[PDB]
Design a protein around this ligand. Structure first.
Ligand SMILES: [O][C]([C][C]C([O])=O)[C]OC1=[C][C]=C(C2345B678B9%10%11B6%12%13B96%14B%109%15B%1172B932B437B%1285B%1363C%14%1527C2=[C][C]=C(C([O])(C(F)(F)F)C(F)(F)F)[C]=[C]2)[C]=[C]1
Lengths: 11, 239
């Protein structure tokens, strides 16, 4: 449940 | 009557789509090359989907109210809608002339055979073509197309949503914008039952999403296929 790429693209 | 607020929403979403959809398809040169029981089209189409995910996130971030959600809720909404918005936005390149997604060039023109060569089966592909044909036949105004994509992303019933009341409040503002747009700006006979037909496309998308995830799980369970995916695809669709 770590979404670092999504989190990063979301800002 | 389309309120000032509703006209503003439409203008934001049209701009957002402009900023995240490149009708020249220039970036396709960057993907691993298409090759036409080997899944010869998997590298190319995985790269295309990975690129498209990045575009869908960029669009979502500009939907009025999306940034007011928690990071957790934004993530749930994007993970659960990504393949549905990619299917919707792909309708722009879809042509009923030969039932293919035509992205500017023969190398980047995808038919049912190409999709099967990325590992998907008729269980997905037949209803996917029927969806593309039915959506294309609605001849949506660009305004309706971008509203439908936004409503798809901001869905309060997605699994794992926490603040379902706020998601629903954002979606209701977009749904009422769309219903009022159709009534005020879409002339008959094209407007006949158009809102209900658009909501039906959202139900069709849930079925396509469930089948895609079933086939994605089957294909990505084989490590040789997972090696050809991208890190973003694995994060969004699962590992
Ligand atoms: O709109 C843009 C350009 C505008 C811009 O500038 O953004 C135009 O581009 C396009 C983007 C995507 C498509 C599609 B079309 B439906 B057919 B299926 B789905 B849409 B996606 B590709 B073609 B296949 C697709 C698909 C492939 C691979 C998997 C897969 O399941 C895989 F690979 F098989 F495992 C994955 F894992 F999800 F990738 C799933 C679905 C066409 C055109």
């Amino acid at each position: 449940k770590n979404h670092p790429m999504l989190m990063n693209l979301l800002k | 009557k389309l309120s000032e607020e509703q006209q503003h929403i439409i203008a934001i979403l049209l701009d957002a789509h402009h900023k995240t959809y490149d009708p020249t398809y220039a970036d396709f040169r960057d993907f691993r090359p298409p090759v036409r029981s080997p899944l010869s089209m998997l590298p190319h189409l995985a790269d295309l989907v990975s690129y498209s995910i990045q575009k869908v996130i960029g669009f979502a971030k500009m939907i009025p109210g999306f940034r007011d959600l928690t990071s957790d809720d934004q993530i749930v909404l994007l993970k659960s809608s990504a393949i549905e918005v990619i299917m919707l936005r792909s309708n722009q390149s879809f042509t009923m002339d030969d039932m293919s997604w035509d992205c500017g060039s023969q190398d980047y023109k995808y038919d049912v055979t190409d999709v099967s060569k990325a590992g998907h089966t008729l269980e997905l592909i037949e209803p996917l073509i029927k969806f593309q044909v039915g959506l294309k036949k609605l001849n949506l105004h660009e305004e309706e197309h971008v509203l439908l994509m936004a409503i798809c992303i901001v869905s309060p019933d997605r699994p794992g949503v926490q603040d379902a009341k706020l998601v629903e409040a954002i979606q209701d503002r977009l749904s009422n914008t769309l219903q009022t747009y159709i009534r005020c700006r879409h002339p008959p006979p094209g407007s006949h039952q158009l809102y209900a037909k658009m909501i039906q496309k959202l139900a069709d998308l849930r079925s396509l999403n469930e089948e895609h995830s079933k086939q994605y799980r089957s294909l990505s369970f084989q490590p040789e296929n997972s090696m050809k995916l991208t890190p973003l695809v694995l994060e969004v669709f699962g590992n």
